[PDB]
Design a protein around this ligand. Sequence first.
Ligand code: HEM
Length: 154
Amino acid sequence: MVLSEGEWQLVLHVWAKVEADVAGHGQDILIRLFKSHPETLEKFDRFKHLKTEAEMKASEDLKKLGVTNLTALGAILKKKGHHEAELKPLAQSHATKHKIPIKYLEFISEAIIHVLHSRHPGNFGADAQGAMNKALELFRKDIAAKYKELGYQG
Ligand code: HEM
């Protein structure tokens, strides 16, 4: 699988809006993830205690993680497929320390698409969503390959 430049531009076009307030998008995405698939929250030893969306929105640390997460993803998307260097540290920590299965990466991918669909209809129509899905499928495919090399293959 390989995205076209046109598809990458649709991806970067909506990400540009995300960057107007990465912290806000991060909260929305993590909260959507945790509510749609509660089991995923259990992987966060530092945030597993949060009981409600209100507590999640009020968590300064969760907001910080959201920023760290989306900024790392943004750097990967901007590489337009040439993200080998960026994927190494991410795959190692998520495979060996956090133990995040591909199934959960699919869940957060679903969350990202849901939030962009809701917040950015102006830059997330059908074709743009297709481009983002293709970019995230590539991300997950390469991460999975790395997982396997690392001995996890979650
Ligand atoms: C878009 C996909 C994701 C990206 C780009 C991403 C990125 C990051 C980054 C940059 C960090 C900090 C550095 C590191 O430890 O590697 C991090 C930490 C972490 N990530 Fe991910 N992550 C993603 C998905 C997930 C998912 C789906 C889960 C589990 C449901 C997860 C769980 C964690 C945990 C538990 C930490 C540690 C948080 C803490 O500081 O307590 N990540 N992630």
